[PDB]
Amino acid sequence: HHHHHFNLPPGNYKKPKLLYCSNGGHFLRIDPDGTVDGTRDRSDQHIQLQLSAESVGEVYIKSTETGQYLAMDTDGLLYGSQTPNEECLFLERLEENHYNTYISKKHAEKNWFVGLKKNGSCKRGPRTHYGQKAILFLPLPVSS
């Protein structure tokens, strides 16, 4: 189990979702240029994400607008990848019996999470850790 707990969130991957971070209220965003950050603008066309399970509890998070995959690099920075690779897999887990957290599969032994600061900037892998609000997400339905 990668030396991590296995409490999984409910919900499925049938439809795209917005990944809302409760820390600052930002939605995760992957720009066509590959930069990742968060925005409070719900009309943004780069916050609609499609998650898919490659194994139970292991997901890819892809921009539905650009087809890019969320990934975390060797130095802990999130970026949008044009193709799927080992840096694009995340262990999706329930947290505080309510939220979803995403731990980098490649860097799971160091507990590097996907996280957004209150100012909307992504947190670097080593700066994240259990207990922070930056790592707590709620997958919300995409607007209609």
UniProtKB/Swiss-Prot annotation:
Outcome, altering S121E: Decrease in LRRC59-binding
What domain of life? Eukaryota
The sequence motif named Nuclear localization signal is recorded at: 14-17
Where located?
Secreted; Cytoplasm; Cytoplasm, Cell cortex; Cytoplasm, Cytosol
- Outcome following mutation: N23A: No effect on integrin-binding
Give the matching CDD domains: beta-trefoil_FGF1
Matching entries from Pfam families are given as:
FGF
Gene Ontology molecular function: fibroblast growth factor receptor binding; growth factor activity; heparin binding; integrin binding; S100 protein binding
The alphabetized list of GO BP terms reads: activation of protein kinase B activity; anatomical structure morphogenesis; angiogenesis; branch elongation involved in ureteric bud branching; cellular response to heat; epithelial cell proliferation; fibroblast growth factor receptor signaling pathway; lung development
* Record SUPFAM superfamilies: Cytokine
Q: What does this protein do?
A: Plays an important role in the regulation of cell survival, cell division, angiogenesis, cell differentiation and cell migration. Functions as a potent mitogen in vitro. Acts as a ligand for FGFR1 and integrins. Binds to FGFR1 in the presence of heparin leading to FGFR1 dimerization and activation via sequential autophosphorylation on tyrosine residues which act as docking sites for interacting proteins, leading to the activation of several signaling cascades. Binds to integrin ITGAV:ITGB3.
Self-association and partners: Monomer. Homodimer. Interacts with FGFR1, FGFR2, FGFR3 and FGFR4. Affinity between fibroblast growth factors (FGFs) and their receptors is increased by heparan sulfate glycosaminoglycans that function as coreceptors. Found in a complex with FGFBP1, FGF1 and FGF2. Interacts with FGFBP1. Part of a Cu(2+)-dependent multiprotein aggregate containing FGF1, S100A13 and SYT1. Interacts with SYT1. Interacts with S100A13. Interacts with LRRC59. Interacts with CSNKA, CSNKB and FIBP. While binding with LRRC59, CSNKA and FIBP seem mutually exclusive, CSNKB and FIBP may cooperatively interact with FGF1.
Q: What is this protein called?
A: Fibroblast growth factor 1
Which organism's genome codes for this protein? Homo sapiens
Show the taxonomic lineage. Eukaryota, Metazoa, Chordata, Craniata, Vertebrata
